[PDB]
A paper describes a structure:
Several repeating motifs have been found in Pon1-228: type A “FxNxx[F/L]” motif and type B “NP[F/Y]E[V/I]xR” motif. Proper combination of both motifs dramatically increased the interaction with [name] [name], whereas the isolated one barely bound to it. For example, Pon fragments containing either B1A2, A2B2, or A3B3 showed significantly enhanced binding avidity to [name] compared with the isolated A or B motifs. To elucidate how combination of A and B motifs can strengthen Pon’s binding to [name] [name], we solved the crystal structures of [name] [name] in complex with Pon A2B2 or Pon B1A2 peptides. The complex structures revealed that either Pon A2B2 or Pon B1A2 binding led [name] to form a symmetric dimer-of-dimers in either a “head-to-head” or “tail-to-tail” organization. Pon binding could also induce [name] dimerization in solution. Despite of the distinct domain arrangement in the two complexes, the A or B motifs from B1A2 and A2B2 occupied the identical sites on [name]. For example, the bulky aromatic ring of Tyr154B2 (same as Phe120B1) inserts into a hydrophobic pocket formed by the side chains of Tyr87, Val117, and Ile139 from [name]. The side chain of Arg158B2 (same as Arg124B1) forms hydrogen bonds with the backbone carbonyl oxygen of Glu92PTB. By analyzing all the [name] or [name]/ligand structures deposited in the Protein Data Bank, we further found that the newly identified B motif-binding hydrophobic pocket on the Drosophila [name] [name] appears to be present in most of other [name] domains.
As the first identified cell fate determinant, [name] transiently forms a basal crescent during mitosis, preferentially segregates to the basal GMC daughter, and then promotes its differentiation to neurons/glia by antagonizing Notch signaling. During NB division, Pon together with [name] is basally localized and is segregated into the basal daughter cell. We found that [name] [name] specifically recognizes the AB motif repeats of its adaptor Pon in a previously unrecognized manner. The multivalent interaction between [name] and Pon can lead to LLPS of the complex, forming condensed, autonomously assembled membrane-lacking compartments both in vitro and in living cells.
Author numbering:
A (entry chain B), B (entry chain B): 131 to 145, 149 to 159
C (entry chain A), D (entry chain A): 64 to 166, 169 to 201
The structure:
Amino acid sequence: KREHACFENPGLNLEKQFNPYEVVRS
Amino acid sequence: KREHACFENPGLNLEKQFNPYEVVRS
Amino acid sequence: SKPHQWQADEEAVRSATCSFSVKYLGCVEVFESRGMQVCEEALKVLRQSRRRPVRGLLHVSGDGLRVVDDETKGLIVDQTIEKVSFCAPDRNHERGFSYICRDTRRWMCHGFLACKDSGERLSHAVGCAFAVCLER
Amino acid sequence: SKPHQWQADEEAVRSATCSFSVKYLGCVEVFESRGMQVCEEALKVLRQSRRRPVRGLLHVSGDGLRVVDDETKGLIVDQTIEKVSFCAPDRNHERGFSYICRDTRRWMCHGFLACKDSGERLSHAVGCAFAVCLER
């Protein structure tokens, strides 16, 4: 058979946990 | 001043959680 | 423009009332995020193992893929859609179906035997969940 | 062939009886795993912030870097050595000291002001913990 009924997810997430001791850069 | 008292860790780990539903390849 | 059964299934996925009776065969690492052959080889591995298949219901929605064990009612698989990359039926088994998701940085293929549907019906349903994922 | 104080400190690190009084300034993301300038800029950021520094003891051993809060006795930092890549004193502050570790895939620099030691003494102690790490 040929390939059929196959689906890729366009919403697949390719791309941070909060640390109270962390200083954010500016 | 010049750099002094700096240390790199040669034991730094650069390089798996067990899943009871997982089948291992052979 | 879908087949009637698929258009109806899309309605059920979008209202979170879509489920299919399955045996969950487990999962196996795969080295690619997509590809029908990658899934078919994973399913071949899963069928070759001696581990007991688990009967349950596969619920498909934008909120996730949930596998609920028939015997225990335990929620034994709870998969967010945003981590699922690919799904496919099986040219070697009319009721086979699998999906590939993130494991960490690895890929895992989760394999199923549908009890009374074709694998391609399950695949289309999961593909509808992908659509909802992209919408959110 | 080390200075006497450093040879003694190495003994204390290896028997897990090495600790230093510090203020813990917190941590900031860094974009490189090593480099004295990377640490010195992190410490500059940490000193510029308004967050309260936490007084405690920094315990150094092969089992980890542990920061125990003086006021509460709470174990507020517990860092395995195998995730620490680099440590350095500070040319801008005689008592400044910091280390870089894994955050996930990111790097974080944890900054300290030693209460009654030079930063380079702390740096050497942590470097001894590196030695033990490689031995294990």
